[PDB]
Amino acid sequence: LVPRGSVHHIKRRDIVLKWELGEGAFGKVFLAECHNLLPEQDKMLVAVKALKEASESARQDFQREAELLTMLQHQHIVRFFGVCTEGRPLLMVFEYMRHGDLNRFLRSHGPDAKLLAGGEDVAPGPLGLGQLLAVASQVAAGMVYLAGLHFVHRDLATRNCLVGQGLVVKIGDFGMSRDIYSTDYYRVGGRTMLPIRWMPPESILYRKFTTESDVWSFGVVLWEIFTYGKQPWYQLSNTEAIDCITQGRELERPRACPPEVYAIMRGCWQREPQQRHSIKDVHARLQALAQAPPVYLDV
Numbered sequence: 001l002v003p004r005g006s007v008h009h010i011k012r013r014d015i016v017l018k019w020e021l022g023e024g025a026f027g028k029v030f031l032a033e034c035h036n037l038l039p040e041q042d043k044m045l046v047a048v049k050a051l052k053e054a055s056e057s058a059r060q061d062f063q064r065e066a067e068l069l070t071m072l073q074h075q076h077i078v079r080f081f082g083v084c085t086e087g088r089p090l091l092m093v094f095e096y097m098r099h100g101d102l103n104r105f106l107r108s109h110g111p112d113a114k115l116l117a118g119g120e121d122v123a124p125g126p127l128g129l130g131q132l133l134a135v136a137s138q139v140a141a142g143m144v145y146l147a148g149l150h151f152v153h154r155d156l157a158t159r160n161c162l163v164g165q166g167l168v169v170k171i172g173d174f175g176m177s178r179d180i181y182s183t184d185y186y187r188v189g190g191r192t193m194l195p196i197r198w199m200p201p202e203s204i205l206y207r208k209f210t211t212e213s214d215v216w217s218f219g220v221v222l223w224e225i226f227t228y229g230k231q232p233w234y235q236l237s238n239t240e241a242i243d244c245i246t247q248g249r250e251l252e253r254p255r256a257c258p259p260e261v262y263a264i265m266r267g268c269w270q271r272e273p274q275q276r277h278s279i280k281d282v283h284a285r286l287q288a289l290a291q292a293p294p295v296y297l298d299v
Helices: 058-071 102-108 129-148 201-206 211-226 238-246 259-268 279-291
Strands: 015-023 027-034 045-051 080-084 091-095 161-163 169-171
Touching: 015 045, 058 080, 058 091, 102 161, 102 211, 129 161, 129 169, 129 211, 129 279, 201 211, 201 238, 211 259, 211 279, 259 279
Parallel strands: none
Antiparallel strands: 015 027, 027 045, 045 091, 080 091, 161 169
16 A cells, blocks of 8 residues: 556557567567557557466566556656556557667677668668767666666666667667577576676675666676677676676777777776766766767777
């Protein structure tokens, strides 16, 4: 009996399901049309998560999620619109992000990309330095918001951010990353899967998760943005990656990454959590560098 959320609700008949976009063990994601959702456009595309169970307990999580989603609303958090409980499966309703998750969007603009990439809103091939820094700065802004609420994300990585038209980037995901990117997790338990390569030593050694462990993961986020989505320590097994983070070894500067960005990343990776700059500090330095992109080019 505490104060509680209030989720907008939505008529199943108002949701016309186009096709599947993705699938995890617990969920399918669809592209869909939603009518009279926002009253100044009739039709509009949305991303609709459908839950695979209605099981007594799997039901009360869906609400507890819906509440929390409704409460976190911010410009770089993916927009949640609300839900539909009128019959089965349950549907959650988000804005649709044309370009998918940031890790995929990065790889599709990699100079290692197999094929070019289209889109009115961004050039194919690799991205301007100002594009990378704006992608960065935008994820940092979601992270400033969350940290302002004192929420800890615990799984920040580009696979868990999403990219919209015009290269708008927002933290958000549909709970399926362990299915869709299962190699980016180490199974330590039975059902327990850790994003090891994005963790700080104190998360790995003490299982302590903080604002500051999120800022470390952010440094790893900048490193992925600058390698065009490569996995950190990809030469290494999960056990070797653990040995690294744990013995103090740090990822190498990517060759797209100017030294001032490598510096920021490096302040995220201080062994001692308190020696790490706040996400506010980082977001300022990244913005300042997005509006005024250093002149770079490589060896």
